Amino acid sequence: DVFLMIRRHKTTIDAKESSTVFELKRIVEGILKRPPDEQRLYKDDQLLGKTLGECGFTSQTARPQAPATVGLAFRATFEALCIEPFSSPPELPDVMKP
Amino acid sequence: MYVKLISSDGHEFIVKREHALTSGTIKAMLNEVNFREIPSHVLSKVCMYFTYKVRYTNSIPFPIAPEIALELLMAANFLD
Amino acid sequence: VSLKCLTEIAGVVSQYEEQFVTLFTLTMMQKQMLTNIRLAYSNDQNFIQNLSLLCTFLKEHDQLIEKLRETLMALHYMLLVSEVTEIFKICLEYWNHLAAELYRESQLYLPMLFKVRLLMVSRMAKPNLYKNMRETLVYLTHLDYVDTERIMTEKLHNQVNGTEWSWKNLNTLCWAIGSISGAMHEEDEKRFLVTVIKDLLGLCEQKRGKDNKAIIASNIMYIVGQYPRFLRAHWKFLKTVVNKLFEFMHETHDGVQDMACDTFIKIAQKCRRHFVQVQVGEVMPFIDEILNNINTIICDLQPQQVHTFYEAVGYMIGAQTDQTVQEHLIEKYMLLPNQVWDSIIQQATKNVDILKDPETVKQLGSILKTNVRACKAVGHPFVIQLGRIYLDMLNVYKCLSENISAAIQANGEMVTKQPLIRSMRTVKRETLKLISGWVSRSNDPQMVAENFVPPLLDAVLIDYQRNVPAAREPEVLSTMAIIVNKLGGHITAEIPQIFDAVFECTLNMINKDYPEHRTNFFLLLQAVNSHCFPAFLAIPPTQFKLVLDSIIWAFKHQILFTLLQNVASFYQTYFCDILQHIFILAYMFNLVE
Amino acid sequence: DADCVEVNALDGYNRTALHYAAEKDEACVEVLLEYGANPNALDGNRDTPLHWAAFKNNAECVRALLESGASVNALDYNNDTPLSWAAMKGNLESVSILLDYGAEVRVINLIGQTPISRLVALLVRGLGKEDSCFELLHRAVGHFLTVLCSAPGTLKTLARYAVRRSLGLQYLPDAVKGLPLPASLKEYLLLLE
Ligand SMILES: *[C@@H](CC(=O)OC(C)C)n1cnc(-c2ccccc2)n1
């Protein structure tokens, strides 16, 4: 298996490592209705037919409790990847500090 | 099939109704839900927890950080 | 000696109570002499022991002293001497007396009885002195169970803590714990047993060395063997200890197997009821499960251990009221002995020479020992196995006798003491013993006379008649007696031949000074006199005269008195002549008068 | 006897008077502590007075030791933490006190046992309040019977375990108060539910 995350702006969204990024794009199409040809995806900070195994996505790297992540863009011209980071947690109470 | 979850801070997440139903609160509420109190990081961690619970239901390897721990406890109390 | 004379004075009438008081005071005053009395004794001791005796003064005159109370609190001196086996026993006698008295009473002595309670547990002996200690202690616990449990837990912990780790202390404490059994109430029993079980398991896990673990396990097994009531309420721990004993049966160290087997059979007797029952959550009566595990459990056990395990299983089977399930239990239970027995019988029908193998006869002897134990445990329901093996067993017995004769002809009876001959004779004796067991516990002596006894006589009577006194096994007579006891009535028609073939030969062996044969003859003759006195009179006139002569030899060496009772020509023949021999008499005087 | 009682000297058994006091009563323990008895003295097997107190279930001695700075998770030569002994004997109260002091459940002794493992073994014997002790252990660990093993468990109890772990080796009942939590959740952290 390979559990994956995808992000774009404030918006967030698994397969087999043997699977390829195109079927993941098809999943993205079904979810958001932007066909794969108007989707482009980025592994790490790298703009991804590659099988998820050869994209670097591995189950040990892609567990459900620690899934992999991907950036997404659409043909608006594909926009520069815009992903808005999650809010940070507040200060840890001193009693809970190490 | 799918369901959308909005964090209090406006971050947005999508899963299958399947996983979201792991929360009793989700089942009580149900296409989309906005949690005007759950921050983005907590909501993302909860999505991870749903996926992990599904993947190891009646399987077990779950990480937690102290900073998010209290928020996670309160949010779990909220979401069953 | 001065003390002993005073002791005798104190040994002997409350009307002299003042004297009995003043004496006690003055001797107590003459404290002026006496401190570690145990030390003084250990390092003219006799004075201390005589001072202990005083013990019997208060056995009597504790009543007259109750009538100087601080001086009585003497009792401390009684403890001092108690610290000193003879002196300790002297003290223990009064301790038991006082404990029983105060217990059966329903305040003066209780404020310090705990001191004695501590003393008893400390000095507890291995299971008369032990009984007195046990009796005294159970009286004390009936005065307070709580303090007894507290003290036992304290010392058990000190052992667990390693503060006092010692085989001796462990053994004595466990002995006292076992002694308390029955005195405790069932709920307090449960609590205390749970505490002690956990503590013992703890010190078992903690301690290294298979020797230490072995002693701890033996103590645990003893204590559990002393508390069937708790085991019944905790059938879970009962199954637990059963499996643990199975484990110990596969041990090879310090005879643990034997010990385990011992423990096993004990509990097997005291809760047989429960094994034959489908207990809470059980798919089956647990006994059946054992009947399946047995093959494995015995794979490490020795023949005596096998006998003990079979006997316990037999008791448990006997607990099975349903004779159908009981038949199934017996079938499975004897199958392995039955299987080997069938193999031997098949080999015999292939060739008699199998019987002429020391190996074959030894296998048969093991089978017979197992069957004897099983019948002893089961009773009549064992009839199924008995009938299963009866005919081929008697054929084997006859073949054994034939081969005994075939050897004897070569050296006279001196073929005896040859190991094969010894084994064959032992096998015949055990066969007779098994027959005796079941027949004594037979349901229908008519059925026995129809199916069992006549073939037995065919195999036994004429053979014994033709045999030589050593091959003429005494047990035969015993068996016959038991037959007479059961087949009283039916047995009548067989009495003549029985005496024709056997009574003559044993009489030849009895008129001499074969003691077991002679004792069996006494009992068998009295049995014939009682059960079948009509047959007794019907004895042929020659054999009847020989019977009277045997009686004469006997009391010339109760049966005569029995004959006098029953017989009420004979008198003018024997009574007149026997009168001089005996010179009952009131009976004789009554008869003539 | 508190009235009857170098205090920290290890005796011929290599143990302190405080060990005996712990095995006997909390009053003597308190008197010794007042006289400066070291709670963390290690005996001939490096079992603390806390270890024996926990085994004896002398809960009052346990609380007195812990309140005086006892080493909650000291490891003897067998490396059995006092929780390990308390669990292997299966007594409840002292186990609860240890859990409130944040004793570590997830531990392994040289024997290769966990305290919950030993408690489970005791329960299997049918001798076992012991069910409540098992319940406290389960709530403290959150997840470790088969269903409780195959079930990943609630996110809630996982968060509770993480929070307690963060609180560390201090008195949890007092610490949880400072947390900005409803009284219900503060109680939940203390495994009272
Ligand atoms: C501890 C281990 C043991 O078996 O000791 C020796 C190696 C034989 N032990 C002793 N007795 C027991 C026990 C357990 C369950 C039921 C009865 C006795 N365990």
Nearest to C376 by CA among C324, C326, C441, C458: C441
Does residue C206 line the site of ligand 1, with CB under 6 A?
no
Q: Give me D140's structure tokens.
A: 């403290």
Q: Looking at this protein, which amino acid is placed at residue D77?
A: Y
Chains D and B touch, contact meaning at least 3 pairs of CB atoms under 8 angstroms apart? yes
How close is the nearest chain C Cα to the Cα of D52, in Å?
Answer: 8
Which of D143, D138, D167 lies closest to D155, judged by CA? D143
Give the helix ranges, DSSP H, for C145-209: 145-160, 167-179, 186-206
Q: Which of A1, A50, A3, A43 is nearest to A22 (CA)?
A: A50
Fold of the domain spanning B1-80: Potassium Channel Kv1.1; Chain A (3.30.710)
What residues does each domain of chain A span? 1-95
CA–CA separation, D131 vs D123, rounded Å? 8
Element (H, E) at C563: helix C559-567
Q: Is C216 in the pocket of ligand 1 (CB under 6 A)?
A: yes
Closest CA to C341 of C366, C313, C358, C317: C366
Entry resolution in angstroms? 4.2
Which residues in D lie closer than 8 A to residue B74 (C-beta atoms)?
181, 185
Interface test with D, best of A63, A92, A96, A97 (most D CBs within 10 A): A96
| Coil/strand/helix, residue A46 | strand
Q: What are the beta bridge partners of residue A78?
A: A75
Dist. CA C453–CA D87, nearest whole Å: 66
C194 contacts chain D (CB < 8 A): yes
Minimal Cα–Cα distance from D26 to chain C, Å?
A: 17
Architecture of domain C444-593: Alpha Horseshoe (1.25)
Spell B60-73 as b/e; 16+ CB within 10 A means b. eebebebbbbbbbb
Domain segments of chain B: what residues? 1-80
Q: Is C294 in the pocket of ligand 1 (CB under 6 A)?
A: no
Secondary structure class of C251 (helix, strand, coil): coil
- b/e burial code for range D64-86 (CB count within 10 A of at least 16 → b): bbbebebbbbbbbebebbbbbbb
Q: Which has the closest alpha carbon to D123: D109, D134, D114?
A: D134
Query: Residue C585, SS3?
Result: helix
CB contacts, 8 Å: B70 with chain D? 159, 163, 179-181
The class (CATH top level) of A1-95 is alpha beta
CB contact (8 A) between residue D13 and residue C194: no
Q: Determine the distance separating the centroid of ligand 1 and the alpha carbon of C283, expressed in angstroms.
A: 27
Burial zone of C278 (CB within 10 Å; 0-12 exposed, 13-18 middle, 19+ buried): exposed
Mutate to test the interface with A, among B51, B57, B68 (most CBs of A within 10 A): B51
Nearest to B51 among A3, A10, A86 (CB): A3
Report whether C84 contacts C48 (CB < 8 A).
yes
D147 C-beta neighbours (distance < 10 Å), count: 7
Method in brief: cryo-EM
Question: How far away, in angstroms, is C197 Cα from ligand 1 center?
Answer: 10
Chains that touch A (3 or more CB pairs under 8 A): B, D
Q: How far is CA C501 from CA B64, C175, C505, C543, in A?
A: 98, 56, 7, 11
- Residue C340 class from Cβ within 10 Å (0-12 exposed, 13-18 middle, 19+ buried)? middle
What are the tokens at C290? 């054992």
Mutate to test the interface with D, among B70, B71, B79, B80 (most CBs of D within 10 A): B70
Q: Is the CB of C241 under 6 A from ligand 1?
A: yes
For ligand 1, whether the C-beta of C377 sits within 6 Å is: no
Which chains have at least 3 CB atom pairs separated by less than 8 Å from chain B?
A: A, D
Instruction: Say if A96 is an interface residue toward chain D (CB within 8 Å).
Output: yes
Identify all chain A residues contacting D166, using CB atoms and an 8 Å cutoff: 96-97
Show the tokens assigned to A83.
Answer: 């992903």
What is the C-alpha separation between D64 and D62, in angstroms, rounded?
5
Cβ distance of A12 and B63 shorter than 8 Å: no
Closest residue in A to B14 (Cα–Cα): A13
Q: For residues A6 and A74, give the distance between their C-alpha atoms in angstroms, rounded to a whole number.
A: 13
Residue C199 Cβ < 6 Å to ligand 1: no
What separation in Å is there between the alpha carbon of D95 and the centre of ligand 1?
Answer: 25
Cα distance from D164 to chain A (closest Cα, Å)? 8
- CB spacing of D163 vs B62 below 8 angstroms: no
Pairing relationship of beta strands A11-12 and B12-16 according to DSSP bridges: parallel
Give the mutation candidate from A16, A63, A97 for the B interface (greatest B CB count, under 10 A).
A63
How would you list the strands of the sheet with B12-16, edge to edge?
A46-47, A39-43, A68-74, A4-8, A11-12, B12-16, B2-6, B32-34
Q: Do B and C touch, counting CB pairs below 8 Å (3 needed)?
A: no
Contacts with D44 from chain C: Cβ below 8 Å: 162
Residues 6+ apart with CB under 8 A from C553: C510, C511
* Beta carbons of C163 and D13 less than 8 Å apart: yes
Ligand 1 pocket: which of C211, C213, C259 to mutate (most atoms within 8 A of CB): C213
Distance from CA of B39 to the nearest CA of A (A): 7
CA of C217 to the centre of ligand 1 (A): 5
C-to-N gaps above 2.5 Å in chain D, after residues: 5, 128, 144
H or E stretch at C275 = helix C272-275
User: Is D170 in Cβ contact with A96 (below 8 Å)?
Assistant: no
Q: Which residues between 160 and 189 in chain D have a beta carbon less than 8 angstroms from any beta carbon of chain A?
A: 163, 166-168, 170, 175, 178-179
**Ligand 1 touching residue C244 (CB < 6 A):** yes
SS3 for chain D is CCCCCCCCCCCCCCCCHHHHHHHHCHHHHHHHHHCCCCCCCCCCCCCCHHHHHHHHCCHHHHHHHHHCCCCCCCCCCCCCCHHHHHHHHCCCHHHHHHHHCCCCCCCCCCCCCCHHHHHHHHHHCCCCCHHHHHHHHHHHHCCCCHHHHHCCCCHHHHHHHHHHHHHCCCCHHHHHHHCCCCHHHHHHHCCCC
Question: Which tokens go with C508?
Answer: 């030849």
Q: Domain ranges in chain C?
A: 1-84, 107-233, 444-593
Q: Identify which of C160, C220, C239 to mutate to test ligand 1's pocket (most ligand atoms within 8 A of the CB).
A: C220
Q: Hey, is A39 helix, strand or coil?
A: strand
Chain B from 17 to 76: CB within 8 A of any D CB: 46, 49, 52-53, 56-60, 62, 64, 66, 69-70, 72-74, 76
The strand pair at A68-74 and A39-43 is best described as antiparallel
Q: Ligand 1 center to residue C247 CA distance, Å?
A: 9
Among D13, C352, D181, B9, smallest CA distance to A88 is for: B9
Per the listing, tokens 């000095």 go with C123
**Which of C357, C341, C329 is CA-nearest to residue C390?**
C341
**Nearest chain C residue to D12, by CA:** C163
